[PDB]
């Protein structure tokens, strides 16, 4: 018998017992909210300046001139030269998206200046080739190359000396001393595919190779190589590799190859094959240019792209051994305010089967225990408390009641 609240009932519930300030106070809160709403609207529109230059560097009189005499020129590409009589060439130009047109030069250009294939500027009206244009420097690809050298040096990469040595004989050694790889005539592996458990040093052994490069290091995002419009993924792959051959001593580093390196499968009923044809435009491309690749999950890579004709070398970044974990530790603790004595060797045996990063968080948590309690020196007792939270706290159950079997 859940009696519905009669209108007579409602009137009393809301007035009987009401604190005499209730109607007023609830009024004040309601007034504020509406007042805040109005406050924003009167000022919410904040001017977004549009990048105008200082008043001094203006030529407004001449500016009206450029807009009036000069005209917009569609940028096109000469795909062929008919050379009708060798005196009336009748060039064929591609307007990109507009159409393919058989055009003729405006008198200003020279017949010999427009060589087949070079980007040519046309006029909106008749499409006469008014001006040659510099070859295409991709706005995205050009930003890809690492212009600021990463600060991580090779002394920061610990416990992977044999894996770094194996990489230095494919990415550095055959690029600084191309004489040991010639005497025996061994073809330098022109690419390594770093694989390992997530957080073992794949991209640190990547930034490290960048700090000592002497080359042009291109950091392939993975995201940019998958574009909405069909084909623009492959068009980027070519425009990256093309940007490498032009440079001397270029290194390309495709981090997270899984993004655009998934095992092929017919899914043509969808845009996935768009990405796949971007890889097949990369498989063709791969097979002085060295190529690196990182993949925490190598098993999802196309068998074709892992063959020893494209990725000649496959470096496995395993979990560090004990003599390396005590070294990965000292690398991250060289700047910590630790007490001189810490038995890092001891902290290496408490982090069994622990990666090169979870060792880092043990060093980062160790201080956080030293900051929680106001000690400016991160003593050893903190680390064991650190290794309990970073490694053990998420390692397994393996607990006392079920661990009194091991002694």
């Amino acid at each position: 018998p859940i009696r519905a609240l009669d209108e007579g009932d409602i009137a009393l519930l809301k007035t009987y017992g009401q604190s005499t300030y209730s109607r007023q106070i609830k009024q004040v809160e309601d007034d504020i909210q509406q007042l805040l709403k109005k406050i924003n609207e009167l000022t919410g529109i904040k001017e977004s300046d549009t990048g105008l230059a200082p008043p001094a560097l203006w030529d407004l009189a001449a500016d009206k001139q450029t807009l009036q005499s000069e005209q917009p020129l569609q940028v096109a590409r000469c795909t062929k030269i008919i050379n009708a009589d060798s005196e009336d060439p009748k060039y064929i130009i591609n307007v990109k998206q507009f159409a393919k047109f058989v055009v003729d030069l405006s008198d200003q250009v020279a017949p010999t200046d427009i060589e087949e294939g070079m980007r040519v500027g046309v006029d909106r009206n008749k499409y006469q080739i008014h001006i040659p244009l510099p070859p295409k420097i991709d706005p995205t690809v050009t930003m890809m190359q690492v212009e600021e050298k990463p600060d991580v040096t090779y002394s920061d990469v610990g416990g992977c000396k044999e894996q770094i040595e194996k990489l230095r004989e494919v990415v550095e050694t055959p690029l600084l001393h191309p004489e040991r790889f010639v005497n025996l005539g061994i073809e330098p592996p022109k690419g390594v595919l770093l694989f390992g458990p997530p957080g073992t040093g794949k991209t640190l052994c990547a930034r490290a190779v960048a700090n000592r490069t002497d080359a042009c290091f291109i950091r392939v995002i993975g995201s940019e190589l998958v574009q909405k419009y069909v084909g623009e993924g492959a068009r980027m792959v070519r425009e990256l590799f093309e940007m490498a051959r032009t440079k001397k001593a270029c290194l390309i580093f495709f981090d997270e190859i899984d993004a655009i390196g998934g095992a092929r499968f017919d899914d043509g009923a969808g845009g996935d094959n768009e990405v796949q044809r971007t890889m097949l435009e990369l498989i063709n491309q791969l097979d002085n240019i060295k190529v690196l690749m990182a993949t925490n999950r190598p098993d999802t890579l196309d068998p074709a792209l892992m063959r020893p004709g494209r990725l000649d070398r496959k470096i496995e970044f395993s979990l560090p051994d004990l003599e390396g974990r005590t070294h990965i530790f000292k690398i991250h603790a060289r700047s910590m305010s630790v007490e001189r004595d810490i038995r890092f060797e001891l902290l290496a045996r408490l982090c069994p089967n622990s990666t090169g990063a979870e060792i880092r968080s043990v060093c980062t948590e160790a201080g956080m225990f030293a900051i929680r309690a106001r000690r400016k020196i991160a003593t050893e007792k903190d680390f064991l408390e650190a290794v309990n939270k970073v490694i053990k706290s998420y390692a397994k159950f393996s607990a006392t009641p079920r661990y009194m079997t091991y002694n």
Binding site: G8, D9, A11, L12, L13, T15, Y16, G17, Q18, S19, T20, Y21, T43, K46, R374
Partner: protein, 832 residues
């Protein structure tokens, strides 16, 4: 619909209402008795909807009229109770109140808590609607508040109890009804409500809430309020009434921390100790004492502060070098540059550079009339005796924040206040003002009198002169000093006013009238004589000094108008206007945080003159308070194109971070130095900002608020106002010849520490759970006033907005609010 119980009750009530149709003898006494039972039974129940009131939807017209005719005696009154109770559910207030007014009395408790409160509201509603035109209605309403208020006191409804009395405009009775278990709830409430309440009720509340603290012998609490009202007489009584010396001792330590001095009669025992405590001679020993435990006795050097290593000797930057070796090492008792090779150091400062460097000598050693005065024995008499003003500021600065029985400031300074050289006098009057700020001593005030009238004195001598007098009589409206200031201000000529330093003359007028908006009506009347612009400018600035910390939205609305206006003689009036909002609104946190939004609007929608004042305005709002939102706001304007805004923003950052050692502010400060390395004016003050952010290695705060941010420090608010307004024109004042004005802050310079001592004054290291303070107002029981607890072993430091509580029940502090030095009385209740 209803049920057998509900439908029958509808009929039973229906029969009773209907039976009153005629005048039968057994219809009025019988029926009204029944309604009395049923209505009483349901209403005096759980919050259950009062079924009698829901069923009873009748009209009282028949019974109201016959009420008069039907037995105007008891039978008449009975009907009133039934109709009155039925009125509270409906909307007949005027009739609803007047029925209990005329109808049967009985007692309020018999009806129900819900009814009682409703009569409470109507009684307050009627009393407010009843003006002084007639008290005949007041006696009945007043009688009602006699009974109802005790009803709330018992029923955990003190909030409504205090609320009920405040509505009536009269809150005396709480004195007689507060129980030993209630004064905390009531006393806390009034202190929290007093700030918001407007004049003059706010003042009346403070004394009343102060009174309640009296009835239960909670003496230290009465102290905090007594100063809040800023009335010395009530302070003197509590001083006199405190038959316990220990409470006498403590209430002097709170009297001292406020900078308040009352001449102690020799009849009061331990007069020297009370005088020495009040004179603040014992402060130096603790401060050095505090340092030894904290291990911060070693002085710092400018180079380490700036950290020249990380970044990728002009006279000016030397001043910034000289200043940083002031504030940073100030009050530590030792500096590594200004105490050993100072003659060498200063000699690379041209005139005003010498003035600044010499003054820092005194600020490097504050609160030591001997050590500093002896650290005041190698420069002042310089071959460029122009620097005499420099040590004179140091001479005056050392005495600032303290009072010595031997009156050193007047002695040394007097012989040179008449010194003909203009620079020699600048240090004299200014330094003297710092030393006796708020003293209001008639002698020094009198001696400063001829300085105003000394025509030979240059204007810069005059502007400091009026400022010096103001800083001495801050917050007292001294008739003699005001007259001297008021008489002096009128005589000023129009041409001589147009200079910047005339901007200081009105400042002195207000500093005399800080905290009293009732008496400033006249002072604004007298100023009307002088011609504009400075008539209007002084009027606004005098207006601001009147309402320092009042929380008066009215004046703020008045002040906001001036800033809102879009006009050069109008911009000085605006600039003081924006700084006006900052000072007025900076009492309550609710308003003060809101002024930030208004400050922000004045910058995006502001104009040249306003945009310069806003960076200063934020400085007063959060002095020594690194609120990230405000510190960020100063930064985004810390690179601004106008030189004035860039400087003011940089100075504001220094104030906001004053003594906080905020790493972010420092890192923010360092990056700015690199950005502005080219411009000496910016680099000087950005370097200065790093100087203010390390005031006393952070062991000091310029915050003008003590006592849980409740007890205002009048002398303090004088200082910050001088530099801040003086910063209203930085280039002529700050960037000009007046680098010394920055020493104006020394008045409010106070320590922030948590040193706990045993009952014998030995440092008693007691676990003190100290964290962000959380209000206990409106929280039932023993609410925790500290959050984000971080147990510190006293002594400890409390960044602004922090409170420390004695985590060990071993001791019962005499004063409830653990700020500054507190006498911990060993708890007799604690048993090991």
């Amino acid at each position: 619909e209803l049920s057998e119980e509900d439908k029958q009750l509808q009929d039973e009530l229906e029969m009773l209402v209907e039976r009153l149709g005629e005048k039968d003898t057994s219809l009025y006494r019988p029926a009204l008795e029944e309604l009395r039972r049923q209505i009483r039974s349901s209403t005096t129940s759980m919050t259950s909807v009062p079924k009698p009131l829901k069923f009873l939807r009748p009209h009282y017209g028949k019974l109201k009229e016959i009420y008069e005719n039907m037995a105007p005696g008891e039978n008449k009154r009975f009907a009133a109770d039934i109709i009155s109770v039925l009125a509270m559910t409906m909307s007949g207030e005027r009739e609803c109140l007047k029925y209990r007014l005329v109808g049967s009395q009985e007692e309020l408790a018999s009806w129900g808590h819900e009814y009682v409160r409703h009569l409470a509201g109507e009684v307050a509603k009627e009393w407010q609607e009843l003006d002084d035109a007639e008290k005949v209605q007041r006696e009945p309403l007043l009688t009602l508040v006699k009974e109802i208020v005790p009803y709330n006191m018992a029923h955990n409804a003190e909030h409504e109890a205090c609320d009920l009395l405040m509505e009536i405009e009269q809150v005396d009775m709480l004195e007689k009804d507060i129980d030993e278990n209630a004064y905390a709830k009531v006393c806390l409430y009034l202190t929290s409500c007093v700030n918001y309440v407007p004049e003059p009720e706010n003042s009346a509340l403070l004394r009343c809430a102060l009174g309640v603290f009296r009835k239960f012998s909670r003496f230290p609490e009465a102290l905090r309020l007594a100063l809040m009202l800023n009335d010395m007489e009530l302070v003197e009584d509590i001083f006199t009434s405190c038959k316990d010396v220990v409470v006498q001792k403590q209430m002097a330590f709170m009297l001292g921390r406020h900078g308040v001095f009352l001449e102690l009669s020799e009849d009061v025992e331990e007069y020297e100790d009370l005088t020495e405590i009040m004179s603040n001679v014992q402060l130096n020993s603790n401060f050095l004492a505090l340092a030894r435990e904290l291990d911060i006795m070693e002085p710092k050097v400018p180079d380490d502060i700036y950290k020249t290593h990380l970044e990728n000797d002009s006279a000016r930057m030397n001043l910034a070098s000289s200043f940083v070796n002031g504030f940073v090492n100030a009050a530590f008792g030792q500096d590594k540059l200004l105490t050993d090779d100072g003659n060498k150091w200063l000699y690379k400062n041209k005139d005003h550079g010498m003035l600044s460097a010499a003054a820092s000598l005194g600020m490097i050693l504050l609160w030591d009339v001997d050590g500093g005065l002896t650290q005041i024995d190698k420069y002042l008499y310089s071959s460029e005796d122009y620097i005499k003003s420099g040590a004179l500021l140091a001479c005056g600065i050392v005495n600032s924040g303290v009072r010595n029985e031997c009156d050193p400031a007047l002695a040394l300074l007097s012989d040179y206040v008449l010194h003909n050289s203009n620079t020699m006098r600048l240090g004299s009057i200014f330094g003297l003002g710092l030393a006796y700020a708020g003293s209001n001593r008639e002698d020094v005030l009198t001696l400063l009198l001829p300085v105003m009238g000394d025509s030979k004195s240059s204007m810069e001598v005059a502007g400091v002169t009026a400022l010096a007098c103001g800083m001495i009589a801050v917050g007292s409206c001294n008739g003699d000093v005001t007259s001297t200031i008021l008489q002096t201000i009128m005589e000023k000529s129009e041409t001589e006013l147009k200079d910047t330093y005339a901007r200081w003359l009105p400042l002195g007028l207000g500093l005399n009238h800080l905290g009293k908006g009732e008496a400033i009506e006249a002072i604004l009347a007298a100023l009307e004589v002088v011609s504009e612009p400075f008539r209007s400018f002084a009027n606004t600035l005098v207006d601001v000094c009147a309402y320092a910390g009042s929380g008066n939205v009215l004046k703020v609305q008045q002040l906001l108008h001036i800033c809102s206006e879009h006009f050069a003689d109008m911009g000085a009036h605006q600039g003081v206007a924006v700084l006006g909002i900052a000072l007025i609104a900076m009492g309550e946190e609710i308003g003060a945080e809101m002024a930030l939004r208004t400050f922000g609007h004045l910058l995006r929608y502001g104009e040249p003159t306003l945009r310069r004042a806003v960076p200063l305005a934020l400085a007063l709002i959060s002095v020594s308070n690194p609120r990230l939102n405000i510190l960020d706001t100063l930064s985004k304007f810390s690179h601004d194109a106008d030189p004035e805004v860039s400087y003011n923003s940089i100075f504001a950052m220094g104030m906001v971070g004053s003594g906080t050692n905020n790493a972010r502010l420092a890192a923010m400060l360092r990056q700015l130095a690199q950005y502005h390395a080219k411009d000496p004016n910016n680099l000087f003050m950005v370097r200065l900002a790093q100087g203010l952010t390390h005031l006393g290695k952070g062991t000091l705060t310029l915050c003008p608020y003590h006592s849980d941010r409740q007890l205002m420090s009048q002398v303090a608010v004088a200082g910050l106002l001088t530099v801040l307004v003086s910063f209203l024109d930085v280039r002529n004042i700050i960037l000009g010849k007046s680098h010394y004005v920055l020493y104006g802050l020394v008045a409010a310079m106070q320590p922030r520490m948590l040193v706990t001592f045993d009952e014998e004054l030995r440092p008693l290291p007691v676990s003190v759970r100290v964290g962000q303070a959380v209000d206990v107002v409106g929280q039932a029981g023993k609410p925790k006033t500290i959050t984000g607890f971080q147990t510190h072993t006293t002594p400890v430091l409390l960044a602004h907005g922090e409170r420390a509580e004695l985590a060990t029940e071993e001791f019962l502090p005499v004063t409830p609010i653990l700020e500054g030095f507190v006498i911990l009385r060993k708890n007799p209740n604690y048993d090991l």
